[PDB]
Amino acid sequence: MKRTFQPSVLKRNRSHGFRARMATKNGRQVLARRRAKGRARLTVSK
Amino acid sequence: IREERLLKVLRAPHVSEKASTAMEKSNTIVLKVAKDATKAEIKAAVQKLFEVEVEVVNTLVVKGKVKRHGQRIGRRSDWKKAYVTLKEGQNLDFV
Amino acid sequence: AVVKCKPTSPGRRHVVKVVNPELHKGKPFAPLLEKNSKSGGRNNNGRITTRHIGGGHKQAYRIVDFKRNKDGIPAVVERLEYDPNRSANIALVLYKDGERRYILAPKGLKAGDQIQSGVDAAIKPGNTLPMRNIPVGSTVHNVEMKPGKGGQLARSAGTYVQIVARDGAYVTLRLRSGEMRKVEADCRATLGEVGNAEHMLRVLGKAGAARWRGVRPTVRGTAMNPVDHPHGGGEGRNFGKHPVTPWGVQTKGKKTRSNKRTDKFIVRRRS
RNA sequence: GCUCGCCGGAAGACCAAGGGUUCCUGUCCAACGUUAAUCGGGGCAGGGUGAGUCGACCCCUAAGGCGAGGCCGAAAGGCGUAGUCGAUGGGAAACAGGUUAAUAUUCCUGUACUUGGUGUUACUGCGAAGGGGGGACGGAGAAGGCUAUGUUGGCCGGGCGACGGUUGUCCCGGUUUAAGCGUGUAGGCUGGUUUUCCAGGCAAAUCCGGAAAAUCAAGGCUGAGGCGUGAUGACGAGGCACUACGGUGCUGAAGCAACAAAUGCCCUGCUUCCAGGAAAAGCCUCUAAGCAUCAGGUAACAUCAAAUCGUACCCCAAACCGACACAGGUGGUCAGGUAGAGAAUACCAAGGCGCUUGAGAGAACUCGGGUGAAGGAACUAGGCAAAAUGGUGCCGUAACUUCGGGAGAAGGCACGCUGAUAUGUAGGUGAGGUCCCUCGCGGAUGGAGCUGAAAUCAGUCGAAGAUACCAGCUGGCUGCAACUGUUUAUUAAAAACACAGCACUGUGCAAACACGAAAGUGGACGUAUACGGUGUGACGCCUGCCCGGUGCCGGAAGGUUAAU
RNA sequence: AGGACCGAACCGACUAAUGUUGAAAAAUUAGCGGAUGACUUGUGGCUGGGGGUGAAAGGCCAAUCAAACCGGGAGAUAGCU
């Protein structure tokens, strides 16, 4: 039936995109944790 | 425009059946150009370097394919293609 | 014209609608209009601070003049309009000099009526003036509580205030709620009453009607679960407690008025 | 290649989203594909996406977001002003044909269009973040004008046909043509023009609004479609040449008329209702600071520019969301024929498919169906399921009723074809002609052609004519709930919830209340005919007793009591 | 005129059977209810867990809800197995 993931790009990027993280204290802490674990990509970007 | 930029625009002649077709039938040549060059600069650069008259330059961007080498997934680089219309009094040189 | 409907469908049965034939059919006066957005009864935290609001038809804000401060310049009534923003009707009036303003439409008002505001104005309904110049005992609406602020009291349809006392700087009013309140005599008021007093007669007849008016359903507390309300579940139909608001404060008789500022003004409570 | 079969308001065609090369060619068959696979949406290599006018960008704002100063807050931070972002909305302009193995409104042929820059020339009061208009807005309804489109006829090309009959009232196929530009029609809206005054439009105004005369009756605005051009052009059944048999080249008939007709357009219109139906910029005009032979504006011709990004393919799905090539889920657009009220249904067209294991056999049993003697609920918790009803017109219809209903109550009757009334009627459309004209896309007359119900009478076939698909079971008594609604996504749709209404009570506006340590916000740009809370729950009849208990409201005399 | 009637798309989920290591972690087939509105649906936004939101079923918040999910305290504690 209608499942849980109905994808949208504009949605995806406003919610989790780079800039969206950088907006806030918490977000920059996420990006800190990721850079510390050494991910391939931090956020969802194209 | 500066000439120094110009000589950096045009990478290579594009060779294929479509290419040959337009070159023969419509009097048009096909170029791989630097990803960032524009219709202005390509018009300039052909008119300058091949010294022949350009009518108009149409362009497109080719997304490189995705390949596998030994299980590894690579991505062929993008690039830009330009259909270059010559005013009819011209006849092709290949150097 | 208050009229019942022939019941051609169960919904239509109890409907009483109030048809004022004198109202302007066709668009309002545009330069006097504003944009208005419905809030869903939700504050700047997006929470619902006031339940039971939302949906409703779209409305445009008519800019109504409550200060009536354009003075000593006659104005005549062009037409009566329906205001979705309030109970009462309104009037589109034309001051001699070429300005138009909306006002509250008082009783006895109809197209063609000369009115005017200022200290000097004649006493007839639809005229405005500071209240020390008003005959004691007279009936008025659109009353200010502070000089120059604009009207606040008795803006609803059919409402009005009776002026029962003049003493020094303070006139005492009998408010529509039945409560005697002092207001400084320098506050302008408007003669007569608010019209469309039959507003209160009209019956909706069907839930849908209330839902057009921007009113969403109301869940009886004692229907909910004990977690959601103090009134709480029970087995079948069970009450057991004294009635309270959802936040636990006692309702049905508890006085919640507390101000010590405004006290010196209030003579006596309504009863 | 040939027959067969299924979809056809889709199982077709085009998008947005989402995917990201799956597109097209060659080549390969390990793995992948529920089997083989020489095939593929699999592997490897190559090719493929061409824009001033289609989108994004860009200009403008909605809700909402961020937010210099600012207010607030232990810190982080919260709120918000000027701003600045944010489309799902408003903002300039391109069409037909030809072409690729794969793009095309982009390439080519033709024919156009818009906005800017410079230039000339003629004329000239130009200037904004300010002013005013415009942009600019609901539901329902009605029906008149049309067009897409279709059917028949004329026309043109071909056909006399595997089996009786077919030179005829016979058969098959075609009968296509756009934006633009000129024209100004069915319709809708609105009096016009000139002069004087007024300061209301935050300052200014010659513009808007207001007042006063003067004068004229047609004036302006809007507008589908038609007609003309576009077009001696294109497309065009086919035929003639060559062919690697895949195609290439040449040539090219007719290309009209009547009728029906949208849910598309006129129409953001018109009529009506109440629940009273975005904002802002481009756009038009008024002027302030200003600048005056400069500048700048208006028109015609010339001239240049129009950047960048998206463009392949899939989108009712084997490519998106479901772990799979998954019987599920996904918004917008187009809408052929006969029958039909119809976008239902049945069969077909354009077009796409036969759902990626078959081959036999023809047991029990299970699934999905079809039929049944005699009986007809005897079954069972219960007529669960099955059967039956089923259409259109006409006749007929009860208790009870809030007068609307109940009611499609119930029940019954005609229903095919052929002929006549009439070689096709009533209606619908309306040619030719004649007359008129303020001469036209005009008016009247006019009735050829074309279309076309319904009925009645006479006949005829069958067991059966609403022959299929399609398409109410009905009646009697009673519980509860007035009613339409809403609900336990995934065992409960109800008698639960809501409900219109009723009552209590709170609340005087800096409202109670609610969210916030606070600022602030909602309540509301509302104001006691308002707003919140609780209970009851249409309508009709009514709502009796009790203040001792808990609670709430009023009282301050005494007794009692905290910090100090 | 209408929370009017019959009835497709559209929205929903009343019964029955099949399915129950399913074609599907809630479907299919045959019937069933609403279908001009308290309707339905697209794009975007808002409300965040001692909270939301709820025509109120303790329903709903990513197939997890009488207090979501992820990381931490943390090797919680476990007279129990």
Residue numbers in the entry:
A (entry chain d): 1 to 46
B (entry chain U): 2 to 96
C (entry chain C): 2 to 272
Sentences from the paper on this structure:
In this process the emerging signal sequence is recognized by the signal recognition particle (SRP) and delivered to the membrane to interact with the SRP receptor (SR), where the nascent chain is transferred to the Sec translocon. In bacteria, SRP is a ribonucleoprotein complex consisting of the SRP protein (Ffh) and the 4.5S SRP RNA that forms a hairpin structure. RNCs are then delivered to the membrane through interaction of SRP with SR (FtsY), during which the N and GTPase domains (termed the NG domain) in both Ffh and SR form a GTP-dependent heterodimer. Subsequently, stimulated by the binding of translocon, the NG heterodimer detaches from the tetraloop (closed state) and repositions to the distal region of the SRP RNA, where insertion of an RNA base into the GTPase active site of SRP and SR induces GTP hydrolysis (activated state).
To resolve the SRP–SR NG heterodimer in the activated state, we assembled a quaternary complex between the SRP, SR, SecYEG and the RNC in the presence of GDP:AlFx. Image classification revealed that in the sample used for the cryo-EM experiment, 16% of the particles contain the quaternary complex. In this complex, the NG heterodimer is in the activated state bound to the distal site of the SRP RNA, where we observe the translocon positioned near the polypeptide exit tunnel (‘Methods' and Supplementary Fig. 2). The SRP RNA is visible in its entirety, along with fully interpretable densities for all domains of Ffh and FtsY as well as a density for the SecYEG translocon, which is anchored by the SR near the ribosome exit tunnel. To improve the resolution of the factors bound in the quaternary complex, additional image sorting and refinement were performed yielding a final reconstruction resolved to 4.8 Å resolution. Starting from the tetraloop, it is kinked upward by 30° and untwisted at the distal site by a 40° rotation, adopting a distinct conformation with the distal region of the SRP RNA lifted by 40 Å away from the surface of the ribosome. The density of the NG heterodimer at the distal site was locally resolved to ∼7–8 Å, which allowed us to unambiguously dock without any further adjustments the crystal structure of the GDP:AlF4 trapped NG heterodimer in complex with the distal region of the SRP RNA (helix 5 of domain S). It contacts H100 of the 23S rRNA through a loop that connects the G-domain of the SRP protein to its N-domain, which we refer to as the ‘NG loop'. Notably, the signal sequence in this complex extends 15 Å from the SRP M-domain towards the Sec translocon along the surface of the ribosome in the vicinity of H59 of the rRNA. Due to the conformational change in the SRP RNA, which is kinked upwards on the distal site and acts as a lever, we observe that the M-domain is now raised on one side, in contrast to its position in the RNC–SRP–SR complex in the closed state.
